[PDB]
């Protein structure tokens, strides 16, 4: 989803982590 993108997955670090939603 939102959280394979780095951009998303850099402001939801805390929010996705290192596994949680994948995608």
């Known amino acids: 989803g ?3 993108n ?3 997955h ?3 670090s805390n929010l996705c982590g290192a ?3 994948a995608g």
Do not use: D, F, W
């Open 6 to 8: 780095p951009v998303c």
């Open 19 to 21: 596994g949680g939603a």
């Open 2 to 4: 939102c959280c394979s």
């Open 10 to 12: 850099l402001e939801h």
